[PDB]
Amino acid sequence: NQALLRILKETEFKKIKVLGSGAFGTVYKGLWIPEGEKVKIPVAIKELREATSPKANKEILDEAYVMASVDNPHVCRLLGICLTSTVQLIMQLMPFGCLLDYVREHKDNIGSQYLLNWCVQIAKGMNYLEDRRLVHRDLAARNVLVKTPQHVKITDFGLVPIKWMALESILHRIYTHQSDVWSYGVTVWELMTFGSKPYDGIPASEISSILEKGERLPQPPICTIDVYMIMRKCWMIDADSRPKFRELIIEFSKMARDPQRYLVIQGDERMHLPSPTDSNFYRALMDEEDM
Amino acid sequence: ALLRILKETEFKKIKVLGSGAFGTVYKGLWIPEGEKVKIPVAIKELREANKEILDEAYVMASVDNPHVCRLLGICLTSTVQLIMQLMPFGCLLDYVREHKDNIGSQYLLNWCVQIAKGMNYLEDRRLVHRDLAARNVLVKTPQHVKITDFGLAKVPIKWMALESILHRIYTHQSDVWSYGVTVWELMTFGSKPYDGIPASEISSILEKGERLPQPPICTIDVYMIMRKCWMIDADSRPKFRELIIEFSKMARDPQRYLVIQGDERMHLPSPTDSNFYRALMDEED
Numbered sequence: 206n207q208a209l210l211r212i213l214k215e216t217e218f219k220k221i222k223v224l225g226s227g228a229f230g231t232v233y234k235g236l237w238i239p240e241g242e243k244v245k246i247p248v249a250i251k252e253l254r255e256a257t258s259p260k261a262n263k264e265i266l267d268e269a270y271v272m273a274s275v276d277n278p279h280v281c282r283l284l285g286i287c288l289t290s291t292v293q294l295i296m297q298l299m300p301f302g303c304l305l306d307y308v309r310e311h312k313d314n315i316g317s318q319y320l321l322n323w324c325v326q327i328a329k330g331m332n333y334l335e336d337r338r339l340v341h342r343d344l345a346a347r348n349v350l351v352k353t354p355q356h357v358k359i360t361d362f363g364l365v366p367i368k369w370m371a372l373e374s375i376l377h378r379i380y381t382h383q384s385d386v387w388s389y390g391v392t393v394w395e396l397m398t399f400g401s402k403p404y405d406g407i408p409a410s411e412i413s414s415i416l417e418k419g420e421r422l423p424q425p426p427i428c429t430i431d432v433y434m435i436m437r438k439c440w441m442i443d444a445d446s447r448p449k450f451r452e453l454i455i456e457f458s459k460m461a462r463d464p465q466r467y468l469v470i471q472g473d474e475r476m477h478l479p480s481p482t483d484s485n486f487y488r489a490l491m492d493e494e495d496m
Numbered sequence: 497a498l499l500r501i502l503k504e505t506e507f508k509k510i511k512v513l514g515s516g517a518f519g520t521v522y523k524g525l526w527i528p529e530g531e532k533v534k535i536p537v538a539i540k541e542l543r544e545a546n547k548e549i550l551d552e553a554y555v556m557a558s559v560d561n562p563h564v565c566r567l568l569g570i571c572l573t574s575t576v577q578l579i580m581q582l583m584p585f586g587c588l589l590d591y592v593r594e595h596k597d598n599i600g601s602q603y604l605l606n607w608c609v610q611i612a613k614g615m616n617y618l619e620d621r622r623l624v625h626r627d628l629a630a631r632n633v634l635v636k637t638p639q640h641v642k643i644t645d646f647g648l649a650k651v652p653i654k655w656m657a658l659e660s661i662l663h664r665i666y667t668h669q670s671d672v673w674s675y676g677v678t679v680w681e682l683m684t685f686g687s688k689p690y691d692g693i694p695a696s697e698i699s700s701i702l703e704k705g706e707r708l709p710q711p712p713i714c715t716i717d718v719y720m721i722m723r724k725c726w727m728i729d730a731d732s733r734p735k736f737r738e739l740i741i742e743f744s745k746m747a748r749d750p751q752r753y754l755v756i757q758g759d760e761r762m763h764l765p766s767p768t769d770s771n772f773y774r775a776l777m778d779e780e781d
């Protein structure tokens with residue numbers, strides 16, 4: 206249990222490059238130096254922005270033990286923590302980065318099989334968090350990490366992103382597994398638009414109004430009606446009418462089996478998944494975990 | 497499909513890590529086509545038909561065991577360049593020298609288990625190493641070692657069985673002799689075997705019945721194993737199967753079989769530190 210979270214010393218790791226920043230901290234590429242060893246192992250470090258007290262560290266640790274306890278191929282696990290004045294959190298470094306950036310950078314290189322498999326894998330990860338009764342609260346393509354292009358994992362769960370939130374979260378601060386489904390719908394839309402900004406040009410303060418009026422994110426140019434309808438079902442006002450994560454796995458798996466029937470992409474026939482050869486090569490170098 | 501054919505343009509060597517009797521090993525970077533990442537690899541540039549090389553290279557790509565390094569890719573355009581996983585800890589010989597004050601019996605005995613497991617697997621596949629030595633055991637984590645450079649035949653006199661020196665016979669039972677030398681290397685914390693004796697004289701002193709001396713930390717139980725690896729009759733030597741069993745037995749009571757000062761303090765990592773180690777560096781089964 207708590208043996209899954211390692212307490213680190215200041216002296217055994219170093220930040221080397223700023224990777225980006227979010228609402229609660231700045232993420233660095235760093236290096237772990239095992240005591241008495243000579244190697245420097247790349248990690249990702251999130252240093253929180255606001256310094257905390259010993260008493261607030263007790264809260265932090267309690268959540269830290271939980272996030273360190275997740276075991277699923279499409280869910281990132283928290284690995285260590287350093288209780289400096291500003292607390293530092295250590296997890297595995299994903300050199301491909303987040304899926305939001307990956308889809309933006311390859312928006313001419315991505316075929317239907319990749320996109321549909323990402324949606325399946327993200328649903329798998331969220332379904333697990335639901336089994337653990339862990340509410341993500343901040344799902345978004347920026348919080349899906351690319352371990353290899355064939356393998357993505359959800360991060361920063363269980364801790365405002367108005368444009369990803371369910372209406373009841375905006376209006377009443379209600380966060381459930383069914384509001385996470387709304388955020389999944391927006392995340393999928395992000396992918397299918399290759400990283401467009403949702404409700405681009407609408408002030409965040411006015412989003413609840415347009416949702417109550419029934420306005421929703423538009424149909425991506427590549428999405429058939431079948432895919433768009435799923436996204437729309439994630440955005441129902443009645444949270445219990447939204448699909449469940451298990452249903453989303455079954456449905457996107459069905460589509461991934463005939464990807465070109467459900468996604469219409471120009472040049473889709475020249476981009477396919479990697480040969481068995483190239484996956485085995487990817488796995489032996491970057492991705493040795495079970496699935 | 498287990499051996500990836502690489503183009504020159506998709507990897508770059510950046511730093512020399514060392515050289516041995518068959519090539520130079522470089523720390524390198526793999527750059528996937530159409531991606532922006534740079535993945536560290538180890539590249540061994542050799543020197544000595546491409547389809548033949550490939551055929552043996554395919555065999556080396558086909559090994560599947562947690563204690564045997566797999567050949568991952570190959571580039572045959574100019575020199576033969578072999579691509580495998582980069583082990584930032586380096587080889588076990590250097591590790592034992594650098595940590596010769598921190599290595600306790602539990603680590604030492606478990607390394608002997610793991611090296612035997614890998615060699616037993618090679619025996620199952622009928623692959624003769626021909627160059628086993630502590631320098632050919634890579635440290636993945638301090639807790640996890642793997643045999644490398646098996647099958648590079650495509651001379652370490654002081655690791656070779658007598659019949660290999662005299663008659664060029666290489667079997668799994670001569671690998672056993674080299675396993676015996678490898679274990680002596682570990683238990684001496686990386687000493688050079690038969691130090692100061694020219695290689696030209698090893699065959700003479702073996703025939704005269706001289707063998708490597710008992711490491712100061714080894715009980716007689718452990719030294720007897722090493723001596724059985726060095727019998728002149730190859731078939732009286734133990735099997736890698738038996739070696740797994742005995743070192744496993746000894747690893748269950750490590751301080752009874754190795755006498756190390758302060759050993760009662762140098763225990764294997766806590767579940768916490770292994771879980772942390774494995775998630776960062778060692779996700780395999």
Ligand SMILES: Nc1ncnc2c1ncn2[C@@H]1O[C@H](COP(=O)(O)OP(=O)(O)NP(=O)(O)O)[C@@H](O)[C@H]1O
Pocket residue numbers: 224225226227228229230231232249296297298299300302303306343345347348350360361366
């Ligand atoms: N484990 C990691 N490995 C590599 N890159 C990472 C890792 N975690 C985060 N990043 C990158 O760092 C960026 C900034 O992290 P973060 O602080 O979580 O902000 P954000 O995810 O973009 N927004 P948010 O978490 O919703 O407030 C991310 O967008 C990623 O590209």
Ligand SMILES: Nc1ncnc2c1ncn2[C@@H]1O[C@H](COP(=O)(O)OP(=O)(O)NP(=O)(O)O)[C@@H](O)[C@H]1O
Pocket residue numbers: 513514515516517518519520521538580581582583584586587627631632634644645
């Ligand atoms: N995958 C690897 N990762 C890290 N270091 C490595 C790797 N492979 C080999 N090395 C190191 O590279 C150096 C040269 O290796 P190598 O060329 O096989 O020579 P050697 O094993 O020391 N002598 P030889 O018996 O001829 O192979 C040694 O210090 C090895 O430890």
Ligand SMILES: O=C(Nc1nccs1)[C@@H](c1cc(F)ccc1O)N1Cc2ccccc2C1=O
Pocket residue numbers: 229232233249250251265266268269272281282283284294295296360361362363364
């Ligand atoms: O560390 C996280 N992200 C990072 N990005 C770069 C390097 S670490 C994030 C997190 C990581 C993970 F693997 C799984 C779920 C997560 O929620 N957590 C955990 C936690 C615990 C207590 C207080 C704050 C945080 C916090 O932010």
Ligand SMILES: [Mg+2]
Pocket residue numbers: 227347348360361
């Ligand atoms: Mg994030």
Ligand SMILES: [Mg+2]
Pocket residue numbers: 516631632644645
């Ligand atoms: Mg070698």
